[PDB]
Every structure is written in structure tokens, then in C-alpha cells.
């Protein structure tokens, strides 16, 4: 099918700062991927983002009833929906499972790669650190970055390039808002 | 701190519409337009909150009418296909005979139309697979997840096959133990 496609998108956005203290609402309309008109609660009326949206800005701004409906959205819509799901969204805390296993940088060489798999945590903010004999190793660290599993859990791999010597102890240390003290897992050669 | 987005789209000539709520990049729920039902991303969500799906269907009707209006304004300028980037991964470290899940992450594409197939040893797999709706991005492209629970074994190889109008050939992303 080579027929041309045409796409309309709308995004109603609620931005929260310090809980529901400061809230900002954006009513955004899109043609394909181009935003053409938006309502910013900081401004109080619609503004054309491109020339394609000027007829909507003028027309919608002439409807005083619609405008005050949008100007109250930070209360009637943003703050309301925040309170509806706060218990299982804002306060959702899942602690990660931390696995450590070796790998190879070259398929025939020796194990020169320590993988710290950090799986199933929420929210995404996390800090992973590598240590060798109680000393933090900041060189040779590669990661996948933060990976979103799409099911309200995150994961990440933090890998340390090193040549393990016998007797060395490596520990991967994880900090996450669901923990009250760092989570450490050791690996011995 | 936090961002909640009510994202909607309507697509011609496919006549596909969608409606969903996003929290910090995760889906809270979407509305099945056919069943006119609220579909919670996690079953727990449906026990603490509710949503009447009729409000979603009314918005989709307006978006349909607006799209015809905006198509005229643009002088019928169609969308440009943006092919996706596909990643295959497991949600936990892989152990033999220990059940796991394969995740196919399809990212940064538009329009939101895609044909996704799981393949085990080159053959299509349908048992136990699941998927998400099209998820919104801040650059206003889309992303999507497909899942395949599986028992890891050295006897099997897997591929996620993704076809998109922005791709010449189907995109195959491989995985093996």
C-alpha cells in the first residue's frame, strides 16, 4: 500500500513541580509531527505555532467560554487526575534485582568484562557504581543506559572492563529511591 | 517532577484512532475503540481508578473531523515515512530452562502502522505474545513494545521482524543464547 497517509495528533499535557504546588497545562495539536497551535496555561490563550494554526488560534480565542475552561484545567484536569492515580504512579516504588556475571569483549579471549544487570526497578532514576577491593573504579565503565521495558519497570546493564586477578573482590553498588541504603553485590575471581 | 499526557491521534486513510494516558513515559491505560473499554496497562490500576471510555470516543470523533480540516489547509501534504529503530532484549538475565521474556522495542517511527512478527527458528510464533499500543514520543514520533515469553535453550534462535512503509526490506533483529 503506497497511498499517502495523513495524521492528526493531540496532546494534553500536565506538568507538576513540587507535587501539585506549581502546575502547568499545555493543549497541543499536531499535523503529522508539526505542532501548529497550542494553549499554554502560562499565557492563558491559544497561540499559533506555525502558519497552519492561525485560523484555530483566532477562532478558539474568540470563544470566552472555551478559554476559561482551559484556564481552569490546571485545577479541574491536571490536579484532579494527579490525585486519581497518585498512589500507583507518583508513589510507585519497585526495588531492582542486581545480578553480576562475567563476559568477553572478544569471543575467544578470557573473561574481561563484568556485567552488573539491574532489572525491574521503578522509577528510572538510578546510580550504579563499580568497586574493586573497596576502591571505586571509574575507568572502563560502559552501560546500555536506562532501558524502559514498557511495563512500568526499567533495567540497565553497567559493564566494567577489567582483567580479574585471583583474590580480587568486585562489588556493584546500586542506589535507587526505593532503597534506604546502597544495594551491593560482590563477585570473586 | 512529573508529566501526565493525554495523547490522541487519528490516521487516514486507515481510519485508525487511539487514546491513552501517559505518566513519565509509561502508559496508564488506553481505550479499545472497538470494545469501547478502558484497558489498564497493569491490572492493579483498574482497582484504584476508573475511566469512562465514552469520553475517548468523542475526542476521536473530533480529531477525525479536524484531520479532514487540516488536510485541506495543508493542501493535502501527506506525512513522510520515518522508519523505525528496532531492539531485541530480555527483561532479565538469561538462564537455561529458566523462563524469561523477549522484548522487541520499536522506536522513532511514523505513521503509527507496523507489522510485527516473532520468529523461532524462522517460523512465526503466536503463543503467549503480547504488545502495547503505539506510544507517544516527545519528538511526536511513536514507539511500541512486543513481548514473547520463552524458555531459553541452545536449540532455538529468535528474530523480531518489523515491516514499516519507511523500510525497503523487512527489518529483522536477532537473538540467540
Amino acid at each position: 500500500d503506497t497511498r499517502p497517509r495523513f495524521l492528526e495528533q493531540v496532546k494534553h499535557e500536565c506538568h507538576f513541580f513540587n507535587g501539585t504546588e506549581r502546575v502547568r497545562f499545555l493543549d497541543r495539536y499536531f499535523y503529522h509531527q508539526e505542532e501548529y497551535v497550542r494553549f499554554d496555561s502560562d499565557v492563558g490563550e491559544y497561540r499559533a505555532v506555525t502558519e497552519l494554526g492561525r485560523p484555530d488560534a483566532e477562532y478558539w480565542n474568540s470563544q470566552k467560554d472555551l478559554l476559561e475552561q482551559k484556564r481552569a484545567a490546571v485545577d479541574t484536569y491536571c490536579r484532579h487526575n494527579y490525585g486519581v492515580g497518585e498512589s500507583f504512579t507518583v508513589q510507585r516504588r519497585v526495588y531492582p534485582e542486581v545480578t553480576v556475571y562475567p563476559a568477553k569483549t572478544q569471543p575467544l579471549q578470557h573473561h574481561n568484562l563484568l556485567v552488573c544487570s539491574v532489572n525491574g526497578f521503578y522509577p528510572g532514576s538510578i546510580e550504579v557504581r563499580w568497586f574493586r577491593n573497596g576502591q571505586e573504579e571509574k575507568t572502563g565503565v560502559v552501560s546500555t543506559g536506562l532501558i524502559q521495558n514498557g511495563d512500568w519497570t526499567f533495567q540497565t546493564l553497567v559493564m566494567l572492563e577489567t582483567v580479574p586477578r585471583s583474590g580480587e573482590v568486585y562489588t556493584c553498588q546500586v542506589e535507587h529511591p526505593s532503597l534506604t541504603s546502597p544495594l551491593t553485590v560482590e563477585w570473586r575471581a | 517532577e512529573h508529566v501526565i499526557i493525554q495523547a490522541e491521534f487519528y490516521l487516514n486513510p486507515d481510519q485508525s484512532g487511539e487514546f491513552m494516558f501517559d505518566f513519565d513515559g509509561d502508559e496508564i491505560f488506553h481505550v479499545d475503540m472497538a470494545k469501547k473499554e478502558t484497558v489498564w496497562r497493569l491490572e492493579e490500576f483498574g482497582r484504584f481508578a476508573s475511566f469512562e471510555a465514552q469520553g475517548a470516543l468523542a475526542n476521536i470523533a473530533v480529531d477525525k473531523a479536524n484531520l479532514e480540516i487540516m488536510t485541506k489547509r495543508s493542501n493535502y501534504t501527506p506525512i513522510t515515512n520515518v522508519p523505525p529503530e528496532v531492539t531485541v532484549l530480555t527483561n532479565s538475565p538469561v538462564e537455561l530452562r529458566e523462563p524469561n521474556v523477549l522484548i522487541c522495542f520499536i522506536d522513532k517511527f511514523t505513521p503509527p502502522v507496523v507489522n510485527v512478527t516473532w520468529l523461532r527458528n524462522g517460523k512465526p510464533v503466536t503463543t503467549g505474545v503480547s504488545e502495547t499500543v503505539f506510544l507517544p514520543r516527545e519528538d511526536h514520533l511513536f514507539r511500541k513494545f512486543h513481548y514473547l515469553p520463552f524458555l531459553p535453550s541452545t536449540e532455538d534462535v529468535y528474530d523480531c521482524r518489523v515491516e514499516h512503509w519507511g523500510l525497503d526490506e523487512p527489518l529483522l533483529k536477532h537473538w540467540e543464547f
Binding site: 494534553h12 487526575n81 486519581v84 492515580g85 | 481508578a49 476508573s50
Partner: peptide, 13 residues
């Protein structure tokens, strides 16, 4: 706790 949908607005014709 019921979620509220922010209504779409019909464009100018």
C-alpha cells in the same frame, strides 16, 4: 477516583 478527559476542540473551517 475517576480520570477526566480534556476535550478536543473542533477546528475552524
Amino acid at each position: 477516583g475517576g480520570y477526566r478527559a480534556r476535550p478536543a476542540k473542533a477546528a475552524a473551517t
